[PDB]
Ligand SMILES: [Cl-]
Ligand SMILES: [Cu+2]
Ligand SMILES: [Cu+2]
Ligand SMILES: [Cu+2]
Ligand SMILES: [Cu+2]
Ligand SMILES: [Cu+2]
């Protein structure tokens with residue numbers, strides 16, 4: 673599986689994930705005047721005001 | 735602007751872009767013995783071995 677890993681609304685970049693990994697993710701939260709966005713391999717558990725989208729196809733976490 | 739967002743050869747689906755966006759895109763790349771296609775809002779620049787289409791009208795990125 674390969675996933676995007678760029679931040680914010682940056683031009684897209686991709687990374688390969690560890691063998692068994694089935695998900696890519698996009699986390700979003702707010703800070704002062706805007707959103708923050710984090711993208712990578714996996715689907716880490718979130719809490720306390722973070723939202724996350726997880727998907728299961730290559731480069732899906734746009 | 736609205737753009738298609740479906741993958742692959744799926745039936746077309748659409749999303750609404752941010753207010754200032756002017757482009758839609760379709761991106762294709764090779765994945766072993768297959769191809770993957772992504773669609774959405776924006777126009778990432780061409781780079782090695784990706785095929786990129788961009789256009790400027792609603793749902794133009796078939
Ligand atoms: Cl992509
Ligand atoms: Cu793949
Ligand atoms: Cu890419
Ligand atoms: Cu922060
Ligand atoms: Cu992508
Ligand atoms: Cu429109």
Ligand SMILES: [Cu+2]
Nearest residue numbers: 735736750792
């Ligand atoms: Cu509209």
Ligand SMILES: [Cu+2]
Nearest residue numbers: 735753754755
């Ligand atoms: Cu507009």
Ligand SMILES: [Cu+2]
Nearest residue numbers: 741742770771
């Ligand atoms: Cu595909």
Ligand SMILES: [Cu+2]
Nearest residue numbers: 780781782783
């Ligand atoms: Cu090149």
Ligand SMILES: [Cu+2]
Nearest residue numbers: 762785786787
């Ligand atoms: Cu072509």
Ligand SMILES: [Cu+2]
Nearest residue numbers: 791792793794
């Ligand atoms: Cu129309």
Ligand SMILES: [Cu+2]
Nearest residue numbers: 738746793796
């Ligand atoms: Cu269409």
Ligand code: NA
Nearest residue numbers: 746747748793
């Ligand atoms: Na449509």
Ligand code: NA
Nearest residue numbers: 745746795796
């Ligand atoms: Na179409």
